[PDB]
Design a protein around this nucleic acid. Sequence first.
DNA 1: GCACGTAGGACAGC
DNA 2: CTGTCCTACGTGCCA
Lengths: 313, 307, 306, 317, 305, 314
Amino acid sequence: HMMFVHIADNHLGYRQYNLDDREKDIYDSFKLCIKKILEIKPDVVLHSGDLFNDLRPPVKALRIAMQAFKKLHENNIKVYIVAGNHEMPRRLGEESPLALLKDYVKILDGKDVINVNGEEIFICGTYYHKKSKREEMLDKLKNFESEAKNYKKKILMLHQGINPYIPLDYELEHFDLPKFSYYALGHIHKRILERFNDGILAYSGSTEIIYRNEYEDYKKEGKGFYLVDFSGNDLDISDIEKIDIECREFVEVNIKDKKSFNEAVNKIERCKNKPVVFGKIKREFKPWFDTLKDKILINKAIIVDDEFIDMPD
Amino acid sequence: HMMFVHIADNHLGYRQYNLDDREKDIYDSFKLCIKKILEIKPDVVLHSGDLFNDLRPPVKALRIAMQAFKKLHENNIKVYIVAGNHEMPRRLGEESPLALLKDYVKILDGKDVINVNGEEIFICGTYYHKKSKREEMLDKLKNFESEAKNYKKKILMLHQGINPYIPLDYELEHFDLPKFSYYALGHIHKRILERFNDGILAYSGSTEIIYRNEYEDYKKEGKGFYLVDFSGNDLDISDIEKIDIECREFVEVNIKDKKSFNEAVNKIERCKNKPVVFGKIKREFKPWFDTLKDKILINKAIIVDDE
Amino acid sequence: MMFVHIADNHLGYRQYNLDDREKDIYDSFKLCIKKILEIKPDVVLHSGDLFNDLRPPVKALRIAMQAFKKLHENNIKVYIVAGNHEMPRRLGEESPLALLKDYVKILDGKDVINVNGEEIFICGTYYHKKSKREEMLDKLKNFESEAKNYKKKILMLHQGINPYIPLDYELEHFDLPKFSYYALGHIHKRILERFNDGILAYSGSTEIIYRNEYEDYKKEGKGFYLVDFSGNDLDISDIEKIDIECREFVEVNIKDKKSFNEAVNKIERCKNKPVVFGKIKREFKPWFDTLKDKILINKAIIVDDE
Amino acid sequence: RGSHMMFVHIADNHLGYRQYNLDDREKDIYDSFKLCIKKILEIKPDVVLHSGDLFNDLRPPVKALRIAMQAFKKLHENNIKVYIVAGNHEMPRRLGEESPLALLKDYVKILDGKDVINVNGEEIFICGTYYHKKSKREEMLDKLKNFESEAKNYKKKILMLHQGINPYIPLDYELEHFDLPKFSYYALGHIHKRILERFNDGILAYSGSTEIIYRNEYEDYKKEGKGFYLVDFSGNDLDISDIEKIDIECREFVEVNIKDKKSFNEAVNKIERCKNKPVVFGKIKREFKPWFDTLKDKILINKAIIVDDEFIDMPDN
Amino acid sequence: SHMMFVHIADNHLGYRQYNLDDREKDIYDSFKLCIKKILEIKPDVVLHSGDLFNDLRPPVKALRIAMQAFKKLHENNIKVYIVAGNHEMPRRLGEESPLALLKDYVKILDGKDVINVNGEEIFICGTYYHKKSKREEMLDKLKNFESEAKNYKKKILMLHQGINPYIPLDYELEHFDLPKFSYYALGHIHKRILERFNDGILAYSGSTEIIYRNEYEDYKKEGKGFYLVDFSGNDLDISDIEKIDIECREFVEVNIKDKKSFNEAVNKIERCKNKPVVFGKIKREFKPWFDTLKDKILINKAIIV
Amino acid sequence: GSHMMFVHIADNHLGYRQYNLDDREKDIYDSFKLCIKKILEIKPDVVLHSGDLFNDLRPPVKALRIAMQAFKKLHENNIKVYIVAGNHEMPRRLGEESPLALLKDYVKILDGKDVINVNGEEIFICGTYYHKKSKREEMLDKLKNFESEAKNYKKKILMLHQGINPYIPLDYELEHFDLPKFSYYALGHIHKRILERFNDGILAYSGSTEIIYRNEYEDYKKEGKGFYLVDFSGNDLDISDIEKIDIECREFVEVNIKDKKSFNEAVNKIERCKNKPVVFGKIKREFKPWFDTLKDKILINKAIIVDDEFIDMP
DNA sequence: GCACGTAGGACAGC
DNA sequence: CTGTCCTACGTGCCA
Ligand SMILES: [Mg+2]
Ligand SMILES: [Mg+2]
Ligand SMILES: [Mg+2]
Ligand SMILES: [Mg+2]
Ligand SMILES: [Mg+2]
Ligand SMILES: [Mg+2]
Ligand SMILES: [Mg+2]
Ligand SMILES: [Mg+2]
Ligand SMILES: [Mg+2]
Ligand SMILES: [Mg+2]
Ligand SMILES: [Mg+2]
Ligand SMILES: [Mg+2]
């Protein structure tokens, strides 16, 4: 009877390694999500910020974003967004690139109660605030709890890092946020879904490998977005699907012998799309690995001249 | 039966001296033109490029731009634009911010025939080319006249510099461009209107003082846009009205004595808008002039420790 | 006090011209070193044949230098004697042992090492040929002279001694003076036993160099010795032998179904992909070729006879 | 001369090469190298570019390794940074095999990419790569363009390579001259003759071999002399005028053509005149052979052909 | 003793710094001062390593002084050798060096010559200043000298160049360029340099006056003048080399930043025995005060701030 | 005989480099060295040099070499030499020295009197350097003092380097009536040969030893360049006792090529030359490339090209 | 299908 | 008894 999508951190227009192919990769994976959300046709899409990677994004990025969210709004899919760190103006009077989506998307900086078929469900959220302004936020957060006291299904949207989920730094502590049915969170690029307070907290995670860390969460959790159903009166992890998205493959290598060289080539041959390779290659195997340049997107491996006597337990 | 607007070089989002106020100024003068164009309700608006000052212009610039061209298209005014030096991509696959206006505007890189009341009229244009590709351009230009041979009222749109009107550099020589009724030109920020070939050539000029030099052309010719009627079969200067737009005034000073100082105070009081001051002021007169810093936009004046 | 006696690694030896085999040698060597590093003895005595050639592969050299650096950085003093393989042949030719000069003391005489907290006398010399036995005897007698007033004395040599190796040998058992411990090398089988009121040892090679060494690996095991020499006297009881896993070799004689099953059983029972050698009847050839994925190399002779 | 910047371009020492199976010749190669090294230490440049073939073999004799390691240590200890590219001789063949260049890892930077060196007080871009074959020229072009890309916004750019370039060596060659982008200096090796000349908007150089490795190198030894280059690169532009060529004393070779008393006496004169027992080669008439056999003590090795022919050849003037 | 000889260079006759009569006179006077001491010494040979004149066409007075000097030196049956410096070297073909005017008193060196002194026989070779560009030629030139000196025991080389260790930028030759000679009579380097080199001893006589603003302190540390080697015995070393220094114009450096540094200025300036040249930096506030004593000073061309 | 003879030479302008040509600078040298040679062939008793030996105050070194080479050779043959400083050789700045100074050991620079005793007579010489017109006053006083000391002398010679009013219209430093009665007037500042009786005696300008300005050529053809050879054997001297030594020097041909004739006259005149001539004058544009055929035959072409079509028909 | 080096076996010793 | 032959085969270039 009801379903909604939690996505965030697309970082539209990010250009890793200054590679054209990569800027494309970000766009494509985004469009892939949009296609899937259009295939799913949920009632709501919660977007937890960092739609754009920059404050003044390339025209292609804006074209795609506007193109996409128009297509969603035309399919009677309601979309809520909170501005991420990257989308927050710095000069006075400066506008967010999110402003271009004003006609297809609701930018959240307060409460809103949305009536779906056939239920009535409460949403509140706010833009990215700094660690500096945490005090400011607490009042805002408490005012949200206040107006949500009498609501059964209440969703909170935020673009911050919460203390256990992100070492240093973080803007909020986990005991800072009130009881909500679902926590649509965004600033953290790894996939996080788990019970919290008396409900369920979530980071949708980035939709492509944006920064240097995300390599293992790609294999371990996969990148994409969440699809919460919220059909019944209760919600648990059991009613939350993770939609995965194919994106640029990264293979990590540690070529030190004939075996590790072949394991590398196997991993590379097995890739559907020309991978980004990283890790370490011993000097002695370097020119031999250079034979795979046709089969590889870019080689970001450190070359090691050192002769190690490393032996296993 | 027909009238149309030639505007160009608004340079949206240019932020002169890194000043907030200057970026506003540019917005303001643009939005004024749009209001005045709406008060006029012409049939066509020809925009000869450099609409945005940047390739990835600020968000406010894009919102202003889209709202403006929406407001024009919803009033059934057809708009043509050609991309200027500033709106042209560098990388392959980089897109022009003009593309964000695709829904209200025809971006020209070829011909198009527009049917007015009750006439049929030929328009063609192309984006900004470099001097380097002049040969390429000649081919393009010759093909336009060919496709226009049997047309009586023909308008050509370009965003280039033409050799007599701008010594160095320029991309085309004036004898490069074929016979057309009207030349909708851009890239030269001063107002230029004069007869040419067997028709009438125009540079609409910038809609605000972009560089410090264009200041006197504001004083001397005035900045804004053109309103050509093109009602009869022939068109002449008599049928071209120039719409002016008030914009930020600049004051030049050379204060070494009481005379030039008093002239300075006079001109500053004489200004309608808090002026941008530049020129020379003697070191000794420095603390005396700082009394008007609240009464002035910005002080970009040179200090002279001698004369 | 404690010390390690190792020898005959034959670094860079490439048996059957096999990549995997040259590796095997490196690997077992690096492993002894790791094991030596986990133990952290005071001294490491190396009785020669570290390298298999005078101009060993770059990797072998690279590995060796790293190894002894790591040992020297852990304040373990290392003595080595030049083996037959490490001895220059044309005049002016240099030994690959020279590349280790900064981590290792190459022995051609005496040296007294002060440990915590004992004082102990070491002597040794490079590999001499049979030809120079006369020469060597004097050298040994010169050692005995300088060691008379010393309590704990070790002799390092890389030779074959007459009883321990039928043919050939450079010294007779009665050629060598009385020492506490005879740190010897050049015989690839493990030899440890009391001798001349002391204890004589060949550490044995650290990998299967010749196909002959095949059974002594299973029967005695390859690696090195760990002598402590803590007390005033030392006996076999205070010598630990560290074993090393290495390449297994299977012998075959396939002429019927029995010997075939003995072979496949022996091969599957192997921990590391085996080297097979021996005799196989021609009629069994394509049938045996089914196991190449489970085998390193097949050096068996094919027999067209009845 | 100075400077804010200076560097030495050396290559092709072929350490451990043993020509004619002569101990003496093997020594010669060693000696001349050491002499280059000594001269560099007296010069004290900021950088030393070595364009490969330091060693003649993949598994070089121990003496060569010690001499080599000693040399680059002594250079590194005097804070001269050394960049090297792998020559044909130093490229591993079996998979996993190591280059003897690896033994210099701590004193030398092996180039297979870009690197920007900060000198006092200038900033200069260096790039290079190991030896590629003709077979992999395509592979190489992409890499070379990648250098051109990464050097455009750089002022001083040096390219290091160990290949033969098409005009400079008819057949064979791995690259064509139009393959390589504009660089300030082309630090090249693999052609054992001394080559220096302007090229593109810059200057291309072969340091040449530091001793007579193959039997061909004779005349360029006499005409150009073997050793290395010393470029200063102090100013923003560089021309030949700012490139000094350091010569090196090495084993003398005399070419002889003994056909009469004159040519015989001229042979003996050149040989007696030699500082070091020369390698004699060329032609000796049969009739003069046993007479020349008197000088075997005075000669390193005699590689001259004996000619039985009686020529009635006569010159005009 | 039985034998002695002199090494001098870089007088730069006719240099007129800041267009001052007194400066050009100073150079002259100091040159003539050097000449006086050479006459007091009475050596067997006099070696001059170039840059005697500052230009190829020097003023007539400079030409007069020089000729007069060497006339006075040649008349004592003292042999003199010279090699052409950078400044004395012709540009057009057919253009002559002013040294040519001294042919009657002097031997200009561009090759070998064996001189018999009392009572020994000694080998001299040298050549003029070559450019960096022509280093190759020079090496060949040098190689031919070594050849003709191999069988000679006492061999002296005369050159006017910068050698790589002794002068970073620029130099024409590297120190390993020059063969073993008994004495390296060098020029073009205005600072005093004397030290052993190869199997012998290399020397730069240094300028006889302060040409550039740099040379002020090197006059204090090494002293300016020329070298006097005897070479009577079989061996040569520093032990047999006396250096005659010559009194010349004092230079004062200033940095007036407070009353103290000003007082330090007055102390050093009043300390000048000879009408001083003042240079350096002066604070805006302190300009007029020395003008009370400006009559007591030669010229104030200190950096303008 | 005789008992006495001497040479009057002047204005060699040594180191002059006309048209910036190596050959011209050489020519000046060559003609000078030739004179010295002829003087040595002659072996006169005295040499009077009326100034302008050098062309500048700072002459090129080659010039100084050649000059000194010459006067030493003259002084060593026991020929005493007197010289006066020309316009060119007189210092301007205070303390500046004359290039004449470099010749002190072979030559006497005159700025006063000196009596030289010959075999077996006693004869008076006086002279002075070049003074400007402005300093004529000084000079007249100087001159009265010269006439005064020579009154009781029978053989008295005057050396000057000036232009005298009739012999040179404008400008001149002295009037002809400015100089006193002397046996011989050794004069120099005028490059043309002038010899004539004057004040019961004889005045002479030796003239330049080469064509310094483009004008002097026809004066060379008509009078010839070189020096004078005076004997002064009797108490009086007249033209009869003055031999004029001529010197071959660089020929200059003037052309005025306007027609076929004038062109042919040009080619003839050039071919007739012993030495590749300096050509000057006018050549019509139309004849330029036809005249370019003679480049091998010519030292330098300094003719104006006239494109103008003149109706010049007298 | 080729080439190349290493290994491995053997024969020559003044 | 070092030296060097010969043959055999692993491994990579390649077509
Ligand atoms: Mg983010
Ligand atoms: Mg974020
Ligand atoms: Mg423009
Ligand atoms: Mg514009
Ligand atoms: Mg062994
Ligand atoms: Mg052994
Ligand atoms: Mg090579
Ligand atoms: Mg080579
Ligand atoms: Mg000099
Ligand atoms: Mg000098
Ligand atoms: Mg005159
Ligand atoms: Mg004259």
